[PDB]
Amino acid sequence: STVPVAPPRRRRGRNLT
Amino acid sequence: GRLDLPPGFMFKVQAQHDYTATDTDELQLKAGDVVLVIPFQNPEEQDEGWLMGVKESDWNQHKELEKCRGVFPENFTERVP
């Protein structure tokens, strides 16, 4: 019962041609 | 707990609930663990709603800091004085 929830982590270091 | 502290140290938190690290930057916590909050190695590495630190017992055992540190859900812990 009544447990917390971890938040969403985000993009970093993104690169393409 | 210790009063000689890691480089750049900000404040401590204490785990209210237990947390298992899912991924390759994340820190593991047990309900009751003190975590020494530290500043990030880059601003893009700071996840929104997250904090970085090292466990106080992991640091009081004087283990490899750069491998013992990680990111955790701040909402699993409380800000201690």
From Swiss-Prot, chain B:
PTM annotation, UniProt: Phosphorylated by protein kinase C.
Expression sites by tissue: Ubiquitous. Highest expression in the brain and muscle. Expressed in oligodendrocytes. Isoform IIA is expressed only in the brain, where it is detected in the gray matter, but not in the white matter. Isoform BIN1 is widely expressed with highest expression in skeletal muscle.
Limits of the SH3 domain: 8-81
Clinical note on disease: Myopathy, centronuclear, 2: A congenital muscle disorder characterized by progressive muscular weakness and wasting involving mainly limb girdle, trunk, and neck muscles. It may also affect distal muscles. Weakness may be present during childhood or adolescence or may not become evident until the third decade of life. Ptosis is a frequent clinical feature. BIN1 mutations have been found in families segregating autosomal dominant centronuclear myopathy. Patients show adult-onset, mildly progressive muscle weakness affecting selected proximal muscles and all distal muscles of the lower limbs.
Physiological role: Is a key player in the control of plasma membrane curvature, membrane shaping and membrane remodeling. Required in muscle cells for the formation of T-tubules, tubular invaginations of the plasma membrane that function in depolarization-contraction coupling. Is a negative regulator of endocytosis. Is also involved in the regulation of intracellular vesicles sorting, modulation of BACE1 trafficking and the control of amyloid-beta production. In neuronal circuits, endocytosis regulation may influence the internalization of PHF-tau aggregates.
Quaternary organization: Heterodimer with AMPH. Binds SH3GLB1. Interacts (via SH3 domain) with DNM1. Interacts with SYNJ1. Interacts (via SH3 domain) with DNM2. Isoform IIA interacts with CLTC. Isoform IIB does not interact with CLTC. Isoform IIC1 does not interact with CLTC. Isoform IIC2 does not interact with CLTC. Interacts with AP2A2. Interacts with AP2B1. Interacts with MYC (via N-terminal transactivation domain); the interaction requires the integrity of the conserved MYC box regions 1 and 2. Interacts with BIN2. Interacts with SNX4. Interacts (via BAR domain) with BACE1. Binds (via BAR domain) F-actin.
Protein name: Myc box-dependent-interacting protein 1
